[PDB]
Structure 1
Amino acid sequence: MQVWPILNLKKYETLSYLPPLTTDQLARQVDYLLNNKWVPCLEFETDHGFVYREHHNSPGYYDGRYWTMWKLPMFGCTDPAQVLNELEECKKEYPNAFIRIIGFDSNREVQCISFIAYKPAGY
C-alpha cells in the first residue's frame, strides 16, 4: 500500500499524471491538434503558475487562469515544426516561465487542447 505524496506534487491539468513527454510524444500531440484543424497558440507565465484567489472569492472567480500570449495564435499553420520552433524560441526568451500549448476550435470557440510543454527549474 503506497501513500500518495503530499509535497511538491503540483499538477498541470491534461497529461500531467503521465510520465514526462519525450520529444516524439510532444510532436504527436501537436500533430493531433493540427490534424483536427485547430489553431495552435503558446502561453507563458513567470509569476503565478497556479490558480489563486486574490481579487474575489465569488463562485467561478479565480485569479491565475490567464497567462500571457506568446506572439499570436498561428492561423494557417500546417507544420508541427513551426509550433515546436516557437516553443524553443519562447524557452530561450523565458527559461524561468511555465509554457503551455493550446489549440483553438474557432467554430465552437473552445480550447480543445491544452498541455504544459515546459516547466522552469525545480518543477
Structure 2
Amino acid sequence: MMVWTPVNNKMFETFSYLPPLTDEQIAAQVDYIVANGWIPCLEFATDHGFVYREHHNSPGYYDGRYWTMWKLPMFGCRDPMQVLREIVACTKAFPDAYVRLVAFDNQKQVQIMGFLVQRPKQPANKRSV
C-alpha cells in the first residue's frame, strides 16, 4: 500500500496526473487544436496559480479562475509553428509565471482544451510513499 502524499502536491487540471509533457507531446496537442479548427490562446498568472475565495462565498463563485491573456486568441491561425512560437515568446516575457495553453470552440462557445506549459521555479513518482 502506498500513501498518496498531501504535501505539496498541487495540481493544474488536465494532464497534471501524467508525466510532464515533452516538446513532442506539446506539439502533438497543438496539431490536435489545428486539425479541429479551434482557436489557440495563451494565458498566464504571476500571482496565485490556484482557485481561492477572497471577495465572495456563494455557490459557483471562485476567485482565481481568470488568468491574464497573452495578446489575443489567434483567430484564423492554422499554423502549429506559430502557436509553438507564441508559447516561447510568452514564457520568455514571463519566465516566472504559470502559463497555460488553451483553445476555444466558437460554435459551442467554450474552452475545449487546456493544459499548463510552465510553472514558476511533486515529481510524477514521489506522489506516493
What TM-score do the two structures reach when normalised by structure 2? 0.92
Cα separation, 2, equivalents of 1:12 and 1:113: 13
- Checking the alignment, whether the CA contact within 8 Å between 2:8 and 2:122 is kept in structure 1 is no
1:27 — aligned with what? 27
Percent of paired sites with the same residue: 62
Cα separation, 1, equivalents of 2:33 and 2:93: 25
Does the residue aligned with 1:91 lie in a helix, a strand or coil?
A: helix
In structure 1, list runs of 5 or more residues that go unmatched: none
Alignment coverage as a number of residue pairs: 123
Does the residue aligned with 1:85 lie in a helix, a strand or coil?
A: helix
- Checking the alignment, whether the CA contact within 8 Å between 2:9 and 2:122 is kept in structure 1 is no
Cα separation, 1, equivalents of 2:110 and 2:89: 26
Cα separation, 2, equivalents of 1:17 and 1:36: 25
Map residues 90-105 of structure 1 onto 2, 5 A cutoff: 90-105=90-105
- Greater relative contact order, per chain length (Cα 8 Å cut-off, separation 6+): 2
Cα separation, 1, equivalents of 2:31 and 2:48: 29
Aligned CA-pair RMSD: 1.3
Cα separation, 2, equivalents of 1:64 and 1:111: 16
Cα separation, 2, equivalents of 1:66 and 1:12: 14
1:47 — aligned with what? 47
Does the residue aligned with 2:42 lie in a helix, a strand or coil?
A: strand
Amino acid across the alignment from 2:45: E
Cα separation, 1, equivalents of 2:71 and 2:81: 16
